[PDB]
PDB file of C-alpha atoms in Angstrom:
ATOM      1  CA  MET A   1     115.558  86.976 100.316  1.00 49.73           C
ATOM      2  CA  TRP A   2     112.376  89.036 100.007  1.00 50.63           C
ATOM      3  CA  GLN A   3     109.575  90.002 102.392  1.00 47.25           C
ATOM      4  CA  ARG A   4     111.920  89.080 105.242  1.00 46.78           C
ATOM      5  CA  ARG A   5     112.001  92.460 106.983  1.00 49.21           C
ATOM      6  CA  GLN A   6     108.377  93.144 106.050  1.00 47.39           C
ATOM      7  CA  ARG A   7     107.530  91.739 109.482  1.00 48.61           C
ATOM      8  CA  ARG A   8     109.760  94.321 111.164  1.00 50.80           C
ATOM      9  CA  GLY A   9     108.890  97.326 109.020  1.00 48.88           C
ATOM     10  CA  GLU A  10     111.846  97.519 106.647  1.00 44.95           C
ATOM     11  CA  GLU A  11     110.844  94.916 104.060  1.00 45.63           C
ATOM     12  CA  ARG A  12     114.428  94.583 102.830  1.00 46.32           C
ATOM     13  CA  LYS A  13     117.896  95.242 104.250  1.00 45.56           C
ATOM     14  CA  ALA A  14     118.670  98.929 103.735  1.00 48.43           C
ATOM     15  CA  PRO A  15     121.130 101.560 105.029  1.00 48.22           C
TER      16      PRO A  15
END
């Protein structure tokens, strides 16, 4: 839910 994309560099799903 949170801090999932933080490992990729986005943190959260965004457009």
